[PDB]
Design a protein around this ligand. Structure first.
Ligand SMILES: O=C(CCCC[PH](c1ccccc1)(c1ccccc1)c1ccccc1)N[C@H](CO)[C@H](O)c1ccc([N+](=O)[O-])cc1
Ligand SMILES: [Mg+2]
Ligand SMILES: [Mg+2]
Ligand SMILES: [Mg+2]
Ligand SMILES: [Mg+2]
Ligand SMILES: [Mg+2]
Ligand SMILES: [Mg+2]
Ligand SMILES: [Mg+2]
Ligand SMILES: [Mg+2]
Ligand SMILES: [Mg+2]
Ligand SMILES: [Mg+2]
Ligand SMILES: [Mg+2]
Ligand SMILES: [Mg+2]
Ligand SMILES: [Mg+2]
Ligand SMILES: [Mg+2]
Ligand SMILES: [Mg+2]
Ligand SMILES: [Mg+2]
Ligand SMILES: [Mg+2]
Ligand SMILES: [Mg+2]
Ligand SMILES: [Mg+2]
Ligand SMILES: [Mg+2]
Ligand SMILES: [Mg+2]
Ligand SMILES: [Mg+2]
Ligand SMILES: [Mg+2]
Ligand SMILES: [Mg+2]
Ligand SMILES: [Mg+2]
Ligand SMILES: [Mg+2]
Ligand SMILES: [Mg+2]
Ligand SMILES: [Mg+2]
Ligand SMILES: [Mg+2]
Ligand SMILES: [Mg+2]
Ligand SMILES: [Mg+2]
Ligand SMILES: [Mg+2]
Ligand SMILES: [Mg+2]
Ligand SMILES: [Mg+2]
Ligand SMILES: [Mg+2]
Ligand SMILES: [Mg+2]
Ligand SMILES: [Mg+2]
Ligand SMILES: [Mg+2]
Ligand SMILES: [Mg+2]
Ligand SMILES: [Mg+2]
Ligand SMILES: [Mg+2]
Ligand SMILES: [Mg+2]
Ligand SMILES: [Mg+2]
Ligand SMILES: [Mg+2]
Ligand SMILES: [Mg+2]
Ligand SMILES: [Mg+2]
Ligand SMILES: [Mg+2]
Ligand SMILES: [Mg+2]
Ligand SMILES: [Mg+2]
Ligand SMILES: [Mg+2]
Ligand SMILES: [Mg+2]
Ligand SMILES: [Mg+2]
Ligand SMILES: [Mg+2]
Ligand SMILES: [Mg+2]
Ligand SMILES: [Mg+2]
Ligand SMILES: [Mg+2]
Ligand SMILES: [Mg+2]
Ligand SMILES: [Mg+2]
Ligand SMILES: [Mg+2]
Ligand SMILES: [Mg+2]
Ligand SMILES: [Mg+2]
Ligand SMILES: [Mg+2]
Ligand SMILES: [Mg+2]
Ligand SMILES: [Mg+2]
Ligand SMILES: [Mg+2]
Ligand SMILES: [Mg+2]
Ligand SMILES: [Mg+2]
Ligand SMILES: [Mg+2]
Ligand SMILES: [Mg+2]
Ligand SMILES: [Mg+2]
Ligand SMILES: [Mg+2]
Ligand SMILES: [Mg+2]
Ligand SMILES: [Mg+2]
Ligand SMILES: [Mg+2]
Ligand SMILES: [Mg+2]
Ligand SMILES: [Mg+2]
Ligand SMILES: [Mg+2]
Ligand SMILES: [Mg+2]
Ligand SMILES: [Mg+2]
Ligand SMILES: [Mg+2]
Ligand SMILES: [Mg+2]
Ligand SMILES: [Mg+2]
Ligand SMILES: [Mg+2]
Ligand SMILES: [Mg+2]
Ligand SMILES: [Mg+2]
Ligand SMILES: [Mg+2]
Ligand SMILES: [Mg+2]
Ligand SMILES: [Mg+2]
Ligand SMILES: [Mg+2]
Ligand SMILES: [Mg+2]
Ligand SMILES: [Mg+2]
Ligand SMILES: [Mg+2]
Ligand SMILES: [Mg+2]
Ligand SMILES: [Mg+2]
Ligand SMILES: [Mg+2]
Ligand SMILES: [Mg+2]
Ligand SMILES: [Mg+2]
Ligand SMILES: [Mg+2]
Ligand SMILES: [Mg+2]
Ligand SMILES: [Mg+2]
Ligand SMILES: [Mg+2]
Ligand SMILES: [Mg+2]
Ligand SMILES: [Mg+2]
Ligand SMILES: [Mg+2]
Ligand SMILES: [Mg+2]
Ligand SMILES: [Mg+2]
Ligand SMILES: [Mg+2]
Ligand SMILES: [Mg+2]
Ligand SMILES: [Mg+2]
Ligand SMILES: [Mg+2]
Ligand SMILES: [Mg+2]
Ligand SMILES: [Mg+2]
Ligand SMILES: [Mg+2]
Ligand SMILES: [Mg+2]
Ligand SMILES: [Mg+2]
Ligand SMILES: [Mg+2]
Ligand SMILES: [Mg+2]
Ligand SMILES: [Mg+2]
Ligand SMILES: [Mg+2]
Ligand SMILES: [Mg+2]
Ligand SMILES: [Mg+2]
Ligand SMILES: [Mg+2]
Ligand SMILES: [Mg+2]
Ligand SMILES: [Mg+2]
Ligand SMILES: [Mg+2]
Ligand SMILES: [Mg+2]
Ligand SMILES: [Mg+2]
Ligand SMILES: [Mg+2]
Ligand SMILES: [Mg+2]
Ligand SMILES: [Mg+2]
Ligand SMILES: [Mg+2]
Ligand SMILES: [Mg+2]
Ligand SMILES: [Mg+2]
Ligand SMILES: [Mg+2]
Ligand SMILES: [Mg+2]
Ligand SMILES: [Mg+2]
Ligand SMILES: [Mg+2]
Ligand SMILES: [Mg+2]
Ligand SMILES: [Mg+2]
Ligand SMILES: [Mg+2]
Ligand SMILES: [Mg+2]
Ligand SMILES: [Mg+2]
Ligand SMILES: [Mg+2]
Ligand SMILES: [Mg+2]
Ligand SMILES: [Mg+2]
Ligand SMILES: [Mg+2]
Ligand SMILES: [Mg+2]
Ligand SMILES: [Mg+2]
Ligand SMILES: [Mg+2]
Ligand SMILES: [Mg+2]
Ligand SMILES: [Mg+2]
Ligand SMILES: [Mg+2]
Ligand SMILES: [Mg+2]
Ligand SMILES: [Mg+2]
Ligand SMILES: [Mg+2]
Ligand SMILES: [Mg+2]
Ligand SMILES: [Mg+2]
Ligand SMILES: [Mg+2]
Ligand SMILES: [Mg+2]
Ligand SMILES: [Mg+2]
Ligand SMILES: [Mg+2]
Ligand SMILES: [Mg+2]
Ligand SMILES: [Mg+2]
Ligand SMILES: [Mg+2]
Ligand SMILES: [Mg+2]
Ligand SMILES: [Mg+2]
Ligand SMILES: [Mg+2]
Ligand SMILES: [Mg+2]
Ligand SMILES: [Mg+2]
Ligand SMILES: [Mg+2]
Ligand SMILES: [Mg+2]
Ligand SMILES: [Mg+2]
Ligand SMILES: [Mg+2]
Ligand SMILES: [Mg+2]
Ligand SMILES: [Mg+2]
Ligand SMILES: [Mg+2]
Ligand SMILES: [Mg+2]
Ligand SMILES: [Mg+2]
Ligand SMILES: [Mg+2]
Ligand SMILES: [Mg+2]
Ligand SMILES: [Mg+2]
Ligand SMILES: [Mg+2]
Ligand SMILES: [Mg+2]
Ligand SMILES: [Mg+2]
Ligand SMILES: [Mg+2]
Ligand SMILES: [Mg+2]
Ligand SMILES: [Mg+2]
Ligand SMILES: [Mg+2]
Ligand SMILES: [Mg+2]
Ligand SMILES: [Mg+2]
Ligand SMILES: [Mg+2]
Ligand SMILES: [Mg+2]
Ligand SMILES: [Mg+2]
Ligand SMILES: [Mg+2]
Ligand SMILES: [Mg+2]
Ligand SMILES: [Mg+2]
Ligand SMILES: [Mg+2]
Ligand SMILES: [Mg+2]
Ligand SMILES: [Mg+2]
Ligand SMILES: [Mg+2]
Ligand SMILES: [Mg+2]
Ligand SMILES: [Mg+2]
Ligand SMILES: [Mg+2]
Ligand SMILES: [Mg+2]
Ligand SMILES: [Mg+2]
Ligand SMILES: [Mg+2]
Ligand SMILES: [Mg+2]
Ligand SMILES: [Mg+2]
Ligand SMILES: [Mg+2]
Ligand SMILES: [Mg+2]
Ligand SMILES: [Mg+2]
Ligand SMILES: [Mg+2]
Ligand SMILES: [Mg+2]
Ligand SMILES: [Mg+2]
Ligand SMILES: [Mg+2]
Ligand SMILES: [Mg+2]
Ligand SMILES: [Mg+2]
Ligand SMILES: [Mg+2]
Ligand SMILES: [Mg+2]
Ligand SMILES: [Mg+2]
Ligand SMILES: [Mg+2]
Ligand SMILES: [Mg+2]
Ligand SMILES: [Mg+2]
Ligand SMILES: [Mg+2]
Ligand SMILES: [Mg+2]
Ligand SMILES: [Mg+2]
Ligand SMILES: [Mg+2]
Ligand SMILES: [Mg+2]
Ligand SMILES: [Mg+2]
Ligand SMILES: [Mg+2]
Ligand SMILES: [Mg+2]
Ligand SMILES: [Mg+2]
Ligand SMILES: [Mg+2]
Ligand SMILES: [Mg+2]
Ligand SMILES: [Mg+2]
Ligand SMILES: [Mg+2]
Ligand SMILES: [Mg+2]
Ligand SMILES: [Mg+2]
Ligand SMILES: [Mg+2]
Ligand SMILES: [Mg+2]
Ligand SMILES: [Mg+2]
Ligand SMILES: [Mg+2]
Ligand SMILES: [Mg+2]
Ligand SMILES: [Mg+2]
Ligand SMILES: [Mg+2]
Ligand SMILES: [Mg+2]
Ligand SMILES: [Mg+2]
Ligand SMILES: [Mg+2]
Ligand SMILES: [Mg+2]
Ligand SMILES: [Mg+2]
Ligand SMILES: [Mg+2]
Ligand SMILES: [Mg+2]
Ligand SMILES: [Mg+2]
Lengths: 275, 48
RNA sequence: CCGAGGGUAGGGCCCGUGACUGGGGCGAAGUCGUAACAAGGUAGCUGUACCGGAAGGUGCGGCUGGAU
RNA sequence: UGGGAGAGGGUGGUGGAAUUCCCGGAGUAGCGGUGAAAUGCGCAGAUACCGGGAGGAACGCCGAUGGCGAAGGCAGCCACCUGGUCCACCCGUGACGCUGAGGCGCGAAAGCGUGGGGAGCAAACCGGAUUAGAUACCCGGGUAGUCCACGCCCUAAACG
RNA sequence: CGAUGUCGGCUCGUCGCAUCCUGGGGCUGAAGAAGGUCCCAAGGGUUGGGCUGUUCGCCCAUUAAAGCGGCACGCGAGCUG
RNA sequence: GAAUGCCGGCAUGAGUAACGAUAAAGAGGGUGAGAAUCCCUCUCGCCGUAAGCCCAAGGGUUCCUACGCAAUGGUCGUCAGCGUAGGGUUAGGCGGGACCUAAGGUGAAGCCGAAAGGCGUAGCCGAAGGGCAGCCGGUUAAUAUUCCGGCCCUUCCCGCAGGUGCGAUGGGGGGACGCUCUAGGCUAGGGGGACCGGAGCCAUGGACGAGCCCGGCCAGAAGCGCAGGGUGGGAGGUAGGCAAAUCCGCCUCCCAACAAGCUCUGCGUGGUGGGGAAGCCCGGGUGACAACCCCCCGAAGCCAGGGAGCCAAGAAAAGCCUCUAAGCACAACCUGCGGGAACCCGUACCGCAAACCGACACAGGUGGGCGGGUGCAAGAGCACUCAGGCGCGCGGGAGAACCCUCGCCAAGGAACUCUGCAAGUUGGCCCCGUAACUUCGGGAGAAGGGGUGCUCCCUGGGGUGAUGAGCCCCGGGGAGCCGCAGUGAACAGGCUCUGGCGACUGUUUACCAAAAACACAGCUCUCUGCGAACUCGUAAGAGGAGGUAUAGGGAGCGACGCUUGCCCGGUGCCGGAAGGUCAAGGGGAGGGGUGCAAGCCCCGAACCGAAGCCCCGGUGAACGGCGGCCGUAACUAUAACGGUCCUAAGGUAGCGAAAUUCCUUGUCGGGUAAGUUCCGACCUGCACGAAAAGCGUAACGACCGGAGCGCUGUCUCGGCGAGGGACCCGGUGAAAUUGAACUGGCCGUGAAGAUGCGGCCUACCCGUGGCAGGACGAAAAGACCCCGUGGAGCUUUACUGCAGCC
RNA sequence: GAGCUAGCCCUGGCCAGGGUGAAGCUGGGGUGAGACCCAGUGGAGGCCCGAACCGGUGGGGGAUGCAAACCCCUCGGAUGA
């Protein structure tokens, strides 16, 4: 579950923390961490291109195995489950009978000391990876590639999962976490099960300081600015929007579809998302 | 209170120095113009 | 030393009262409708929820203390 | 000790019919709805027919004046975990019992919180009729909710 | 308009009299006492509070009386703001 | 002769303001032409978590010494951070380079751009981070971890001896990490000693004393001791660590394991080298053959890469160890020892300031370390004071008004005023005690009160010792003493009741606004399937993100509680393969120019022909909107009810004279002797209302209202006192302003407010301290207002383009 | 031109002292087992008081200033955005 606090400060009243109970190792593997270059939202020109970024806790980036068809047939023991600051899910440390060590994102139900494997012949069990054209229709799955050998792209966030809905030619039909129905090539790898740490979404940040620890600087409404800054700027006293609600750059932000209409992906997208 | 000039020799050499001017076209013109005018010092003096 | 009591300060309970406000009872010589008693003209009653000038309605479940 | 019946409860799985939606075919002038209608849907190809897919809820015949539970209540099918109850043997214990203010637990529906889910249904709501009027009954829509997990609520014509 | 600072208050006054009081008068529907009204008169006097930024005004308690106006709606090189 | 003209010169204000912290001065003696100001002595005062000491920036000779005083120095000057001259900065170990990387910068390959140029993995550069070997004392006028002394150490080269499969820019280990809390043992620093050393002192009534005053240490290789840090050993298998690998990783087996051992560090001791006070005497000598010991306190520093807990999950690369490849195995490397070798730059002095940033020797600003003692609960607070440093570069008088900063005040006590503005009161610690309401944390230091010094006596536990003495620490119970007063001085909340707004901590208009504004957790809508959307860029490339719908972007709303109604006709957005309109292009009935002709050239209807717009539908936590008239009930009054106009639909819950109410000080109630404010109500709401959210809400607020208690010079209503000015004398000596002036009152006149015109009145000449009514006083070519076919920012269904998108 | 200022990036450093006493853990009570209750321990927090440090609330002074934003008194934050 998620952990509550007694209200001994104004902010501890609603603040809630992850219970951190599936974790067995509190230190990262040294050969698998590299420094994460903080950007602040700035680009190679030095310009802010994503607003209100920066000042978050320092982090080392843990290298994650998003291929796994790397080591077809070679099993590995689940040695430990770790915290990872660079993603919502937890990471599992794998010990291969090869001797090689690697990281995957922990599916829900992984056990320390469990054996997992990856390949066309792999058992359909939580933690194993297979090409999609071998996972039985119906089973939920995660860490799905979008194209063969290009890396796991779908269902990598905490609690997320995709389900296989059928097969058509060289393609399987997936229901992504958004509800979109998508053709994905049958030779794209995936890992049977759902991503763990599903209680992530019930966390209550609790105070402005917690947002800041995460590298999220305070966001400022256009309505609180001036006409030089935002379409919603100016006005005497408070003001309604007085125009279709817009972004800082003028485009409308209530309903306007923005996917590129002629994108070739459309041939493979069965049904736009829900909700 | 704290004023605008807070001297710093590395900041002075790396900002206005000769090598900084020679990199940029606008910097080479600054030197061309100061040499045309007959300036005694083409760049600020920094002690290193 | 204790000490009637007086003094300062903070509490607890009760009683009288208060602009105004809530429903209740009774009065009957009114206005609106007709909710219930006949299958009372939508069987009724019911806990609850939402709603409507009003009696009331409807949903969900329950009872027969329901006519044929 | 031995045996029996049962929708008693809890958990995880799985089966088929049907409704709705979407994809393909084929086909055209209405369909739907009512006491009669209209709103509604339909030449932007509906309804009726065939194939495929998706999803949720409830389990037809068996089913009955039936069965089970302390009550609320429990109904497709498989398994696991588990309660109560009856019978025959008359073997063990030797009044160890009855009740029960307080207490604790359970407690239909509706309602509440957090998060899923959402096909059908349907408060509120919108429209059509009915009518003297019709904030209703009847018709076309339709959101909570009804469903699942966890925590509250603790009511009833909770009745025999 | 190459600037004459604008409401109210405080302080400091000074002047006019169409006089609020005190002084002197005529008439009264002036018995007395107390008033009404008009004339003469500017020497002095003309309170303390509650409300509001207020000027004003209402109100409390008094008073012989609680006057009204001018001085750049007197006075920011005097203060307040 | 005027341009608030330009440059320069010199006046006026004026012997006026001022001479830069109110920390403070006096005298004696010297020097000298000249002395409040320079040097010396004595007395006084100020700083002492500095106003003392060290370091990094920045400054650049300001350092030392001699000789000087024109200018600089707010006066003076014989002095100086000033003038002239001479001297002064010494390193293998301290800092930087001949080492490593961080962001960033540059950039073989490579990519992009009219040119200039933009990017870019590796590499290179880049430090106050990593790494790396020096401590104490002495010496100079001036440098010292640099010279000297004592004791240590590092690297490179060569040689010798031993040992080993040696060898790397390649593989691996390591380097290597957060915040809060914290153990043990140390050291830095400190207090005490009746003990050790010491020049001396006996005052003024007493004291020859367990007297007074002074000091009682610093470094130190190997070894040893104490405390820690780090590290398991063996064998077999091996398909992984872009080759190899005996290394590392993985699996299994066996002794070992909170041990030891091995290794490293800190502290102690340590051969040895140093230092060494007060006082007296002229920085030096003496004290002195100085003593150099014990007890107590004890770090935030050290052992250290220690321990624990927590979530926000906490650099890199080289040095180093290991592994092997080419190679090489007479070499090569490792260990010990020896001899040789060891370069470049900095080093003065200032450094919280008179030497840096502020035009000034400027009350401002400036990063790190040390920062003693006593007392007050603690402490870096406060008072005093050590070492050390100062008395602030004009003085002497006087004792006015007035100003400033401060002290007191009879009786009253907010009567002051826009407001208790300001100033009082309160004040630390210990104990007793403490309300509504509440999200159960709080509100709370609630409120309110009692205690507080010193003396004696009895006594409980702790630390260090040893279990004792001593030292130090936390208490208890008695009995007394003094004063007006015991946190006796300094530092240290006034409190309560009740509304508005915002949940809260935060943030903001550098330099007139700190708030109710911004942000904020949280709520909802919406976009985005990843070469994501979106953002920056012509592009390449980037951010997003080494993220993947429990994610990222945009918007509104803003803890939490209870909630969030009706209108989709207009605008927006979403969906809609039909229809209507639609450009280039396709098409070519037909028509034209020309030539004698084949031919060449032009126009050109039907029909075909995208998006968009029209059209159908959806959509409000999208832009937004949410009525009017007549009539009706046993008296009046009102209208549950009916009728009728209009609309896309006529404001629901809640709230309401409100941060909204014009009329308005609505009416009534409460508080007051009196209440335009405040609180509670009513509702004809000029002109609330539901995420530009509605109504509430404990806690919070240097926010804004209303009331009270306490206490006050706020006031009645003022008085006195203090210091710094104001004044007088000596020294230095500005400023805005200034047509020129020989510059009076009244009643008038005058461009309508006259020192300057008329009449009359008044008036001897010139200053000093004072006050501010006038000189439409000074300052700023009015910010308001208008005007100019003047400008700029912003807006849109103004016009016309452009990017971007289709 | 970011040696002032604003934001971010890399790498360092600073925050006396005192007060409150969350989770957890241990013991006891409690039950069929629990919830939970008490005590000791513990040491949480955009927690409390208050120096450094960062500020700039109210008032007074200053106004050709010590200062082209200063001074005094008072006041806000002070393990955190
Ligand atoms: O305009 C002004 C003087 C306005 C000065 C206000 P200011 C100031 C300037 C100098 C000296 C004193 C005060 C100021 C105003 C603007 C800019 C700078 C300074 C100020 C200072 C503080 C607070 C408020 C104002 N007088 C004009 C004559 O030209 C005239 O008499 C006048 C016309 C119309 C009204 N009228 O009531 O309409 C009032 C007065
Ligand atoms: Mg909580
Ligand atoms: Mg807690
Ligand atoms: Mg809890
Ligand atoms: Mg709170
Ligand atoms: Mg936890
Ligand atoms: Mg976990
Ligand atoms: Mg879990
Ligand atoms: Mg770590
Ligand atoms: Mg690394
Ligand atoms: Mg990275
Ligand atoms: Mg990065
Ligand atoms: Mg770059
Ligand atoms: Mg650039
Ligand atoms: Mg962006
Ligand atoms: Mg940013
Ligand atoms: Mg994680
Ligand atoms: Mg999580
Ligand atoms: Mg959340
Ligand atoms: Mg973070
Ligand atoms: Mg946000
Ligand atoms: Mg915002
Ligand atoms: Mg604004
Ligand atoms: Mg701008
Ligand atoms: Mg614009
Ligand atoms: Mg704009
Ligand atoms: Mg606007
Ligand atoms: Mg507006
Ligand atoms: Mg606005
Ligand atoms: Mg407005
Ligand atoms: Mg605004
Ligand atoms: Mg606004
Ligand atoms: Mg606002
Ligand atoms: Mg709006
Ligand atoms: Mg607007
Ligand atoms: Mg609008
Ligand atoms: Mg694709
Ligand atoms: Mg300057
Ligand atoms: Mg600086
Ligand atoms: Mg300089
Ligand atoms: Mg520098
Ligand atoms: Mg530097
Ligand atoms: Mg620099
Ligand atoms: Mg340069
Ligand atoms: Mg020259
Ligand atoms: Mg130059
Ligand atoms: Mg008595
Ligand atoms: Mg009836
Ligand atoms: Mg009926
Ligand atoms: Mg009605
Ligand atoms: Mg209804
Ligand atoms: Mg029943
Ligand atoms: Mg009946
Ligand atoms: Mg579905
Ligand atoms: Mg049946
Ligand atoms: Mg039955
Ligand atoms: Mg028997
Ligand atoms: Mg129930
Ligand atoms: Mg639905
Ligand atoms: Mg009607
Ligand atoms: Mg609802
Ligand atoms: Mg709901
Ligand atoms: Mg329900
Ligand atoms: Mg029954
Ligand atoms: Mg004017
Ligand atoms: Mg002028
Ligand atoms: Mg008479
Ligand atoms: Mg009479
Ligand atoms: Mg008369
Ligand atoms: Mg007469
Ligand atoms: Mg008179
Ligand atoms: Mg007179
Ligand atoms: Mg008035
Ligand atoms: Mg009288
Ligand atoms: Mg007047
Ligand atoms: Mg005037
Ligand atoms: Mg007038
Ligand atoms: Mg007037
Ligand atoms: Mg006036
Ligand atoms: Mg005036
Ligand atoms: Mg003024
Ligand atoms: Mg005035
Ligand atoms: Mg004046
Ligand atoms: Mg004047
Ligand atoms: Mg005033
Ligand atoms: Mg004002
Ligand atoms: Mg002329
Ligand atoms: Mg002039
Ligand atoms: Mg001139
Ligand atoms: Mg000139
Ligand atoms: Mg002259
Ligand atoms: Mg003068
Ligand atoms: Mg001066
Ligand atoms: Mg002198
Ligand atoms: Mg002299
Ligand atoms: Mg001297
Ligand atoms: Mg001290
Ligand atoms: Mg200089
Ligand atoms: Mg020197
Ligand atoms: Mg010199
Ligand atoms: Mg001189
Ligand atoms: Mg001289
Ligand atoms: Mg001079
Ligand atoms: Mg001089
Ligand atoms: Mg000077
Ligand atoms: Mg001389
Ligand atoms: Mg000097
Ligand atoms: Mg010399
Ligand atoms: Mg040396
Ligand atoms: Mg070299
Ligand atoms: Mg390098
Ligand atoms: Mg370095
Ligand atoms: Mg070194
Ligand atoms: Mg040494
Ligand atoms: Mg020297
Ligand atoms: Mg080797
Ligand atoms: Mg690391
Ligand atoms: Mg580090
Ligand atoms: Mg911290
Ligand atoms: Mg001590
Ligand atoms: Mg003694
Ligand atoms: Mg020891
Ligand atoms: Mg191997
Ligand atoms: Mg000596
Ligand atoms: Mg001797
Ligand atoms: Mg001797
Ligand atoms: Mg500390
Ligand atoms: Mg550690
Ligand atoms: Mg976390
Ligand atoms: Mg790196
Ligand atoms: Mg070979
Ligand atoms: Mg060896
Ligand atoms: Mg060299
Ligand atoms: Mg030196
Ligand atoms: Mg200072
Ligand atoms: Mg300092
Ligand atoms: Mg200046
Ligand atoms: Mg000076
Ligand atoms: Mg200074
Ligand atoms: Mg010391
Ligand atoms: Mg004290
Ligand atoms: Mg104290
Ligand atoms: Mg202090
Ligand atoms: Mg002392
Ligand atoms: Mg002085
Ligand atoms: Mg005098
Ligand atoms: Mg003073
Ligand atoms: Mg006295
Ligand atoms: Mg008094
Ligand atoms: Mg009083
Ligand atoms: Mg009193
Ligand atoms: Mg007040
Ligand atoms: Mg109370
Ligand atoms: Mg409570
Ligand atoms: Mg609290
Ligand atoms: Mg108290
Ligand atoms: Mg209170
Ligand atoms: Mg005493
Ligand atoms: Mg003091
Ligand atoms: Mg005090
Ligand atoms: Mg206080
Ligand atoms: Mg209160
Ligand atoms: Mg509010
Ligand atoms: Mg605010
Ligand atoms: Mg606030
Ligand atoms: Mg709130
Ligand atoms: Mg806030
Ligand atoms: Mg400001
Ligand atoms: Mg400003
Ligand atoms: Mg300014
Ligand atoms: Mg400004
Ligand atoms: Mg402000
Ligand atoms: Mg504030
Ligand atoms: Mg703001
Ligand atoms: Mg805000
Ligand atoms: Mg909310
Ligand atoms: Mg762009
Ligand atoms: Mg790129
Ligand atoms: Mg990227
Ligand atoms: Mg990236
Ligand atoms: Mg992402
Ligand atoms: Mg908020
Ligand atoms: Mg906000
Ligand atoms: Mg509540
Ligand atoms: Mg609409
Ligand atoms: Mg519309
Ligand atoms: Mg409609
Ligand atoms: Mg519009
Ligand atoms: Mg058709
Ligand atoms: Mg033709
Ligand atoms: Mg022709
Ligand atoms: Mg709405
Ligand atoms: Mg809504
Ligand atoms: Mg409209
Ligand atoms: Mg709107
Ligand atoms: Mg009537
Ligand atoms: Mg209205
Ligand atoms: Mg409504
Ligand atoms: Mg009202
Ligand atoms: Mg009123
Ligand atoms: Mg209101
Ligand atoms: Mg209004
Ligand atoms: Mg009005
Ligand atoms: Mg009003
Ligand atoms: Mg008004
Ligand atoms: Mg009135
Ligand atoms: Mg008021
Ligand atoms: Mg009214
Ligand atoms: Mg808004
Ligand atoms: Mg508003
Ligand atoms: Mg709204
Ligand atoms: Mg606040
Ligand atoms: Mg505030
Ligand atoms: Mg006074
Ligand atoms: Mg005195
Ligand atoms: Mg004086
Ligand atoms: Mg005096
Ligand atoms: Mg003349
Ligand atoms: Mg006049
Ligand atoms: Mg005149
Ligand atoms: Mg005259
Ligand atoms: Mg004349
Ligand atoms: Mg004349
Ligand atoms: Mg004449
Ligand atoms: Mg004349
Ligand atoms: Mg005269
Ligand atoms: Mg004057
Ligand atoms: Mg004047
Ligand atoms: Mg004049
Ligand atoms: Mg004037
Ligand atoms: Mg001016
Ligand atoms: Mg001009
Ligand atoms: Mg003008
Ligand atoms: Mg003008
Ligand atoms: Mg005008
Ligand atoms: Mg025009
Ligand atoms: Mg014109
Ligand atoms: Mg313009
Ligand atoms: Mg776009
Ligand atoms: Mg760092
Ligand atoms: Mg701190
Ligand atoms: Mg405790
Ligand atoms: Mg624990
Ligand atoms: Mg804080
Ligand atoms: Mg705090
Ligand atoms: Mg605090
Ligand atoms: Mg201030
Ligand atoms: Mg004050
Ligand atoms: Mg004062
Ligand atoms: Mg100051
Ligand atoms: Mg101060
Ligand atoms: Mg704070
Ligand atoms: Mg504080
Ligand atoms: Mg603190």
């Amino acid at each position: 579950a998620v952990k509550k606090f007694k209200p001994y400060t104004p902010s501890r009243r609603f603040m809630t923390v992850a219970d951190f109970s599936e974790i067995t190792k509190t230190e990262p593997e040294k050969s698998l961490v590299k420094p994460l270059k903080k950007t602040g939202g700035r680009n190679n020109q030095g310009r802010i291109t994503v607003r209100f970024r920066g000042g978050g806790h320092k982090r080392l980036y843990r290298i994650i195995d998003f291929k796994r068809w790397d080591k077809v047939g070679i099993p590995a023991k689940v040695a430990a489950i770790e915290y990872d600051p660079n993603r919502s899910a937890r990471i599992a440390l794998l010990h291969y009978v090869d001797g090689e060590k690697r990281y995957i994102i922990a599916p829900d139900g992984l056990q320390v000391g469990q054996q997992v494997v990856a390949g066309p012949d792999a058992p359909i069990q939580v933690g194993n990876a297979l090409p999609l054209r071998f996972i039985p229709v119906g089973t939920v799955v995660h860490a799905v590639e979008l194209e063969p050998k290009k890396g796991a792209k779908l269902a990598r966030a905490a609690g997320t999962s995709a389900q296989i809905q059928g097969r058509e030619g060289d393609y399987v039909i997936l229901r992504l976490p958004s509800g979109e129905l998508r053709k994905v090539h049958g030779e794209c790898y995936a890992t049977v099960g759902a991503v763990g740490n599903a209680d992530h979404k019930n966390i209550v940040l609790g105070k402005a300081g917690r947002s800041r620890w995460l590298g999220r600087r305070p966001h400022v409404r256009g309505a609180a600015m001036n006409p030089v800054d935002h379409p919603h700027g100016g006005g005497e006293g408070r003001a309604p929007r007085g125009r279709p609600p817009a972004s800082p750059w003028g485009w409308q932000t209530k309903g306007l579809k923005t996917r590129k209409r002629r994108k070739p992906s459309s041939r493979f997208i069965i049904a736009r998302r829900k909700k | 209170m704290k004023r605008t000039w807070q001297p710093n020799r590395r900041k002075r050499a790396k900002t206005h120095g000769f090598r900084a001017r020679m990199r940029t076209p606008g910097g080479r013109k600054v030197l061309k113009r100061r040499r045309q005018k007959g300036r005694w010092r083409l760049t600020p003096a920094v002690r290193k």
